């Protein structure tokens, strides 16, 4: 059975007075698991999870030369302190530095952005709105199952952009590594249109398998942001994917 | 003297654990009063105070036919419940309905928007960024002192746009009226660049004088938004402008 | 509750608001969206009285349309004659003249308009019985002109919709000058009147309540033997508006 | 000052009843630090640290097609349980799977192995001994300072192999990652020729700097192997490189 619902994971959302969805994909078995098949297939603004395709396109087009190229702060103080400095691709993805990616999107332009998202089969492929803000308050929407389909292509270097572009973005996605697992992932927090949601999408590399994941959860305030990773890890532990 | 600093108004900011400026202009005496000349001249994003020039331009170019024309809710559920309904110019200005004004700005377009703000001598006249979001996160900046200069021209029908455009916007600015005074004004809340500030700009019509006002204050959360009107009214009452 | 399709529905319960103040009169309401009227007294709702200072609305419109008044800033110099109402004994503009019901300013407008244009304009406006018989500068106080509360509403609806046979500008300036009350829940544009020259002495308040998604037109009059009860015009109207859930 | 001696670091060695050297290189400042200048320049058998150059050569010559290619266990039960199974480049590096790298070395051959170590300026460049064991019991010798020189070239993609080969080996070196730092490194344990020593070589990636490191310590028994990483992290902590 390709897709199975496991409502026992709702206890992790309940425990934290939260509502949301975790989707897992066992790459070896080609099987999916979620607490909520309906919500797994509901589309939301990608917010900063869009930094994964945006990075790939920026690299492929040479808007980003490499992961060391410096993107100057515009000197506007914003409310995430780590944003108010020069960045490279690694630090811009680590700290979700929106203004750096807004500059990439302007240099990419609407025609190339649209073509690339169609070829990626990325969400509804709709860039309507401002080319520098559409993933925040424009027409683009993606479901957790659609995030998994896209991430599997990236994992296997199967996107049409260069192998090099794909390797550099996976390096930039690096979030955690230890003796048991590697996590490559991207957070997002969509606030400009309801419902306000938190994302975490990516994969867990084990010695002998890869588990893809995409989660979103209701996030009425920034107070709950750490629950994005905390709830995913509680599900990964329950399923014995990580110790 | 054209400008005088009255630091006693700081008592009103301090009582509300707040920081900001109130600027008053006595039209009859051509004299200004502020608690803080320095902050009175600091330029900030106008945010929803931009709905005053945006309304004028939209009416002058016929983007808005009249104050009854209905602008249909686009069906995207947003944060402010009153935005999720149809609006005319009157209700759109009352509830600060951004999406309505974003549509006005797109129809106006960057060339006419830029030229109109130059004719108005409006703040730094800089519309850099997205034509539909520059007053939220683009290049435009205006100080409390510069808001007064603009509002005086609107009050006297001295802006280059039609008298009709000016009359309809002043109708739309109506905020409060009783047997003692009329307030025409517009709130704003700038959150996308630091420092987050609240605005209230407009004027008090008396039988035999007009007092222009422009106030802004630090607004780290939405909890303090009522302080924009409350602190301004404390100053107006101290100065015997209103009971 | 009320019935659909009905033109005018009587609600005698509002008489309680008059009786409380040892008074009697009529409130008429018109729901613009629903095209339905309500009154405590179907007979008095339709009784035609001298308009007295409510005439300042059409008088204002005609004076502006003909250029007798240039704009709402033009100063009308006090003629030097000390009258009973202190607020009349000073310079006025259209805004302050309408707020303080400054009869002498409007008498001067009426003489400049003159009988032929005043008559033509009231016919174009379908205003009350359209009769200006009497002194060109006092007919709305002691001449032949008569208007009911329902006819005040008819006229006011045309003004609200800029449908009177004068410039849009004239209509916008007069609606500005009618501004009486505003807050985050409602706006009232209205004009008071006090007919004292011909019995029975009555008080008026006519205008409308602007809501986000509707307009409620109103016209009230009440017996007013002395100026002591003039504040009851607004007070009783607000009791009715509160009862009908039009204002909180 | 090219190299500074900091003997206060010896406290990390004595607290662990151990003797050895840590060498750090601050890439931004082009300055080195060590607890023992003379041992920093002492050349030892590289043992499994040789897996870094061997991986690069194997990739560039196509012995390894990519990091997914499976290297079938030869069926020989060996002392380290994790070696008794199939491996790819990632797991062969993680578990230091000598037999996989011995097969790489036979496929590379003496002539190409020699030319590549000359091209890399690697240690004494001397491969004399068994083509499949010279890094364990042959003539090759490298100091901690020479490990850092070699690693700086790999970090900057300056070795005379392709950018792709360098990017794949740096992926395979991934050891630890969190919100504070990333460590790419390789352990070694030289037991075949006295003196028995342990290695750890690699670097710490920070947001704004890279700290290269090479440590070796006396290792009479396998009981102290965890001290390779533990003593290095005690130094990084003392220098405020990691929290
Ligand atoms: C809020 C929005 O800018 C968000 C996004 O684009 O998804 C940024 C800010 C954040 S969380 C900071 C909280 N800010 C709330 N406005 C992240 C993240 O953690 O990935 N990305
Ligand atoms: C938030 C921003 O759009 C702001 C503006 O553009 O000035 C909106 C929201 C608000 S306050 C509503 C509560 N805050 C939500 N951001 C107002 C205002 O009062 O003028 N306008
Ligand atoms: C009395 C008459 O002039 C009257 C009118 O024209 O309607 C004036 C006086 C007044 S109230 C003054 C009370 N004394 C009246 N004699 C008003 C009003 O309330 O609109 N207007
Ligand atoms: Br392409
Ligand atoms: Br590559
Ligand atoms: Br990596
Ligand atoms: Br056009
Ligand atoms: Br001016
Ligand atoms: Br007009
Ligand atoms: Br008005
Ligand atoms: Br080892």
PDB file of N, CA, C and O in Angstrom, chain B residues 120-146:
ATOM      1  N   UNK B 120       3.494  66.121  -5.370  1.00  0.00           N
ATOM      2  CA  UNK B 120       2.990  66.277  -3.992  1.00  0.00           C
ATOM      3  C   UNK B 120       4.116  66.675  -3.028  1.00  0.00           C
ATOM      4  O   UNK B 120       3.810  66.949  -1.853  1.00  0.00           O
ATOM      5  N   UNK B 121       5.374  66.621  -3.464  1.00  0.00           N
ATOM      6  CA  UNK B 121       6.557  66.765  -2.571  1.00  0.00           C
ATOM      7  C   UNK B 121       6.403  65.799  -1.374  1.00  0.00           C
ATOM      8  O   UNK B 121       6.639  66.190  -0.207  1.00  0.00           O
ATOM      9  N   UNK B 122       5.963  64.565  -1.648  1.00  0.00           N
ATOM     10  CA  UNK B 122       5.587  63.598  -0.594  1.00  0.00           C
ATOM     11  C   UNK B 122       6.819  62.829  -0.099  1.00  0.00           C
ATOM     12  O   UNK B 122       7.338  62.010  -0.862  1.00  0.00           O
ATOM     13  N   UNK B 123       7.209  63.053   1.166  1.00  0.00           N
ATOM     14  CA  UNK B 123       8.381  62.416   1.790  1.00  0.00           C
ATOM     15  C   UNK B 123       9.574  62.454   0.843  1.00  0.00           C
ATOM     16  O   UNK B 123       9.819  63.517   0.269  1.00  0.00           O
ATOM     17  N   UNK B 124      10.281  61.332   0.684  1.00  0.00           N
ATOM     18  CA  UNK B 124      11.508  61.278  -0.146  1.00  0.00           C
ATOM     19  C   UNK B 124      11.145  60.999  -1.609  1.00  0.00           C
ATOM     20  O   UNK B 124      12.093  60.894  -2.414  1.00  0.00           O
ATOM     21  N   UNK B 125       9.847  60.900  -1.942  1.00  0.00           N
ATOM     22  CA  UNK B 125       9.358  60.751  -3.337  1.00  0.00           C
ATOM     23  C   UNK B 125       9.912  59.474  -3.981  1.00  0.00           C
ATOM     24  O   UNK B 125       9.889  59.360  -5.249  1.00  0.00           O
ATOM     25  N   UNK B 126      10.415  58.542  -3.181  1.00  0.00           N
ATOM     26  CA  UNK B 126      11.135  57.347  -3.691  1.00  0.00           C
ATOM     27  C   UNK B 126      10.185  56.145  -3.650  1.00  0.00           C
ATOM     28  O   UNK B 126       9.826  55.705  -2.538  1.00  0.00           O
ATOM     29  N   UNK B 127       9.809  55.598  -4.805  1.00  0.00           N
ATOM     30  CA  UNK B 127       8.853  54.445  -4.849  1.00  0.00           C
ATOM     31  C   UNK B 127       9.605  53.146  -5.155  1.00  0.00           C
ATOM     32  O   UNK B 127       8.958  52.137  -5.509  1.00  0.00           O
ATOM     33  N   UNK B 128      10.920  53.122  -4.979  1.00  0.00           N
ATOM     34  CA  UNK B 128      11.700  51.910  -5.307  1.00  0.00           C
ATOM     35  C   UNK B 128      11.080  50.690  -4.600  1.00  0.00           C
ATOM     36  O   UNK B 128      10.549  50.812  -3.464  1.00  0.00           O
ATOM     37  N   UNK B 129      11.096  49.551  -5.284  1.00  0.00           N
ATOM     38  CA  UNK B 129      10.507  48.290  -4.809  1.00  0.00           C
ATOM     39  C   UNK B 129       9.325  47.936  -5.680  1.00  0.00           C
ATOM     40  O   UNK B 129       9.288  48.380  -6.857  1.00  0.00           O
ATOM     41  N   UNK B 130       8.370  47.200  -5.138  1.00  0.00           N
ATOM     42  CA  UNK B 130       7.186  46.757  -5.909  1.00  0.00           C
ATOM     43  C   UNK B 130       6.160  47.880  -5.907  1.00  0.00           C
ATOM     44  O   UNK B 130       5.889  48.443  -4.855  1.00  0.00           O
ATOM     45  N   UNK B 131       5.586  48.182  -7.062  1.00  0.00           N
ATOM     46  CA  UNK B 131       4.591  49.278  -7.118  1.00  0.00           C
ATOM     47  C   UNK B 131       3.451  49.000  -6.127  1.00  0.00           C
ATOM     48  O   UNK B 131       2.815  49.981  -5.682  1.00  0.00           O
ATOM     49  N   UNK B 132       3.154  47.737  -5.818  1.00  0.00           N
ATOM     50  CA  UNK B 132       2.021  47.399  -4.930  1.00  0.00           C
ATOM     51  C   UNK B 132       2.435  47.228  -3.464  1.00  0.00           C
ATOM     52  O   UNK B 132       1.539  46.883  -2.655  1.00  0.00           O
ATOM     53  N   UNK B 133       3.706  47.445  -3.095  1.00  0.00           N
ATOM     54  CA  UNK B 133       4.153  47.237  -1.685  1.00  0.00           C
ATOM     55  C   UNK B 133       5.257  48.204  -1.243  1.00  0.00           C
ATOM     56  O   UNK B 133       5.839  47.965  -0.174  1.00  0.00           O
ATOM     57  N   UNK B 134       5.556  49.254  -1.997  1.00  0.00           N
ATOM     58  CA  UNK B 134       6.733  50.117  -1.702  1.00  0.00           C
ATOM     59  C   UNK B 134       6.526  50.896  -0.393  1.00  0.00           C
ATOM     60  O   UNK B 134       7.516  51.239   0.257  1.00  0.00           O
ATOM     61  N   UNK B 135       5.286  51.186  -0.010  1.00  0.00           N
ATOM     62  CA  UNK B 135       4.963  51.927   1.234  1.00  0.00           C
ATOM     63  C   UNK B 135       5.028  50.984   2.431  1.00  0.00           C
ATOM     64  O   UNK B 135       4.887  51.486   3.549  1.00  0.00           O
ATOM     65  N   UNK B 136       5.241  49.687   2.201  1.00  0.00           N
ATOM     66  CA  UNK B 136       5.328  48.659   3.280  1.00  0.00           C
ATOM     67  C   UNK B 136       6.780  48.204   3.428  1.00  0.00           C
ATOM     68  O   UNK B 136       7.202  47.966   4.566  1.00  0.00           O
ATOM     69  N   UNK B 137       7.496  48.038   2.312  1.00  0.00           N
ATOM     70  CA  UNK B 137       8.884  47.504   2.365  1.00  0.00           C
ATOM     71  C   UNK B 137       9.755  48.007   1.209  1.00  0.00           C
ATOM     72  O   UNK B 137      10.784  47.364   0.953  1.00  0.00           O
ATOM     73  N   UNK B 138       9.396  49.126   0.582  1.00  0.00           N
ATOM     74  CA  UNK B 138      10.156  49.733  -0.520  1.00  0.00           C
ATOM     75  C   UNK B 138      10.914  50.948  -0.022  1.00  0.00           C
ATOM     76  O   UNK B 138      11.195  51.022   1.196  1.00  0.00           O
ATOM     77  N   UNK B 139      11.189  51.893  -0.920  1.00  0.00           N
ATOM     78  CA  UNK B 139      12.111  53.022  -0.691  1.00  0.00           C
ATOM     79  C   UNK B 139      11.474  54.246  -0.062  1.00  0.00           C
ATOM     80  O   UNK B 139      12.231  55.121   0.388  1.00  0.00           O
ATOM     81  N   UNK B 140      10.149  54.343  -0.030  1.00  0.00           N
ATOM     82  CA  UNK B 140       9.470  55.591   0.410  1.00  0.00           C
ATOM     83  C   UNK B 140       9.653  55.788   1.929  1.00  0.00           C
ATOM     84  O   UNK B 140       9.479  54.841   2.740  1.00  0.00           O
ATOM     85  N   UNK B 141       9.989  57.026   2.309  1.00  0.00           N
ATOM     86  CA  UNK B 141      10.180  57.426   3.724  1.00  0.00           C
ATOM     87  C   UNK B 141       9.572  58.809   3.889  1.00  0.00           C
ATOM     88  O   UNK B 141       9.667  59.627   2.955  1.00  0.00           O
ATOM     89  N   UNK B 142       8.931  59.029   5.031  1.00  0.00           N
ATOM     90  CA  UNK B 142       8.323  60.336   5.373  1.00  0.00           C
ATOM     91  C   UNK B 142       8.406  60.550   6.882  1.00  0.00           C
ATOM     92  O   UNK B 142       8.262  59.593   7.629  1.00  0.00           O
ATOM     93  N   UNK B 143       8.715  61.776   7.308  1.00  0.00           N
ATOM     94  CA  UNK B 143       8.773  62.149   8.737  1.00  0.00           C
ATOM     95  C   UNK B 143       7.422  62.723   9.165  1.00  0.00           C
ATOM     96  O   UNK B 143       6.586  63.110   8.308  1.00  0.00           O
ATOM     97  N   UNK B 144       7.219  62.839  10.469  1.00  0.00           N
ATOM     98  CA  UNK B 144       6.014  63.487  11.011  1.00  0.00           C
ATOM     99  C   UNK B 144       5.941  64.933  10.493  1.00  0.00           C
ATOM    100  O   UNK B 144       4.828  65.379  10.136  1.00  0.00           O
ATOM    101  N   UNK B 145       7.066  65.662  10.466  1.00  0.00           N
ATOM    102  CA  UNK B 145       7.083  67.054   9.975  1.00  0.00           C
ATOM    103  C   UNK B 145       6.639  67.079   8.495  1.00  0.00           C
ATOM    104  O   UNK B 145       5.824  67.948   8.092  1.00  0.00           O
ATOM    105  N   UNK B 146       7.075  66.119   7.701  1.00  0.00           N
ATOM    106  CA  UNK B 146       6.745  66.066   6.253  1.00  0.00           C
ATOM    107  C   UNK B 146       5.276  65.651   6.061  1.00  0.00           C
ATOM    108  O   UNK B 146       4.671  66.062   5.103  1.00  0.00           O
TER     109      UNK B 146
END
